[PDB]
């Protein structure tokens, strides 16, 4: 299947308490492999997956340098945004960045991303064509004009299609054993009466990778997708994920329901009946 590389960064300003807190993480698919935390001891980019540890000291130096540089420009970005919006210097603000690339099954470029949020909302994003920017407001319009004049997009696009893709192929190769695994969900059903007339049917999916999955309930053959409670996919901590979906059924009617599981790891979707 497709694969992805992502870097996420967050800077949170803390006026009166020093410089912004800065945290960056790197992912291949749903596997974290690197991190940097401004409040941690090393002040280095650090490994978080075994297959990245084999990279030499040049790698760690270059990556540390780039991530630190990014934290510094983030600091200035926070100041500038304060000017653009005329916001008080007493308020804490958040700057988020996502960057990365998607490749397909044989490793060919699929997509590239470079986008920013300010205080939880879209600020500026590289468009899918990798040739221009979407600015979500007027401040971001200022930034957008600057980046057009600076010709940032040519560099970013070339980086996305070249360096990012080659990096992703590299990582996928070195982390072969773990990253190219697909783990099908182990499913089951539980029954919890809530009264003399009402019961809860709960369909569970466990031990699966990658994290993307679909869990649906249907009565006879018709979806129940507004009567289904559906919790957020969660990490087990072992590299796999967990999810469940529940429906309330009339006592005696349990046998009418089916749970359906769609996952990349299954040759075919599952149908489960009580």
């Amino acid at each position: 299947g497709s694969h992805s590389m992502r870097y996420f960064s967050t800077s949170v300003s803390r006026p009166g308490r020093g410089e912004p807190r800065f945290i960056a993480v790197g992912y291949v698919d749903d596997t974290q492999f690197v991190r940097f935390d401004s409040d941690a001891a090393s002040q280095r980019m650090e490994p978080r997956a075994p297959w990245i540890e084999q990279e030499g000291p040049e790698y760690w130096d270059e990556e540390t340098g780039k991530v630190k540089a990014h934290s510094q420009t983030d600091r200035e970005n926070l100041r500038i945004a304060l000017r653009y919006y005329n916001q008080s210097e007493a308020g804490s603000h958040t700057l988020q960045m996502m960057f990365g690339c998607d490749v397909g099954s044989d490793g060919r470029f699929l997509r590239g991303y470079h986008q920013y949020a300010y205080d939880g909302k879209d600020y500026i994003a590289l468009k899918e064509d990798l040739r221009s920017w979407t600015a979500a407001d007027m401040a971001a319009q200022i930034t957008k004009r600057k980046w057009e004049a600076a010709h940032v997009a040519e560099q970013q696009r070339a980086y996305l299609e070249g360096t990012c893709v080659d990096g992703l192929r590299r990582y996928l190769e070195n982390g072969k054993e773990t990253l190219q695994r697909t783990d099908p969900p182990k499913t089951h059903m539980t029954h919890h009466p809530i009264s003399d007339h009402e019961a809860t049917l709960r369909c569970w999916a466990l031990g699966f990778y990658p994290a993307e999955i679909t869990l649906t309930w249907q009565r006879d053959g018709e979806d129940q997708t507004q009567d289904t409670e559906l919790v957020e996919t969660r990490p087990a901590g072992d590299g796999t994920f967990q999810k469940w979906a529940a429906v309330v059924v009339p006592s005696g009617e349990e046998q009418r329901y089916t749970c359906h599981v769609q996952h990349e790891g299954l040759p075919k979707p599952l149908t489960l009946r009580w």
């Binding site: 870097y7 960056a24 790197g26 980019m45 990556e63 780039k66 991530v67 540089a69 990014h70 420009t73 983030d74 200035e76 970005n77 500038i80 945004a81 653009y84 960045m97 960057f99 470079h114 200022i142 930034t143 600057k146 980046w147 600076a150 940032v152 560099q155 970013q156 980086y159 360096t163 990012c164 990096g167």
Partner: peptide
């Protein structure tokens, strides 16, 4: 590989 980044 971490990206290079530009000021706002």
């Amino acid at each position: 590989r971490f990206p290079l980044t530009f000021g706002w």
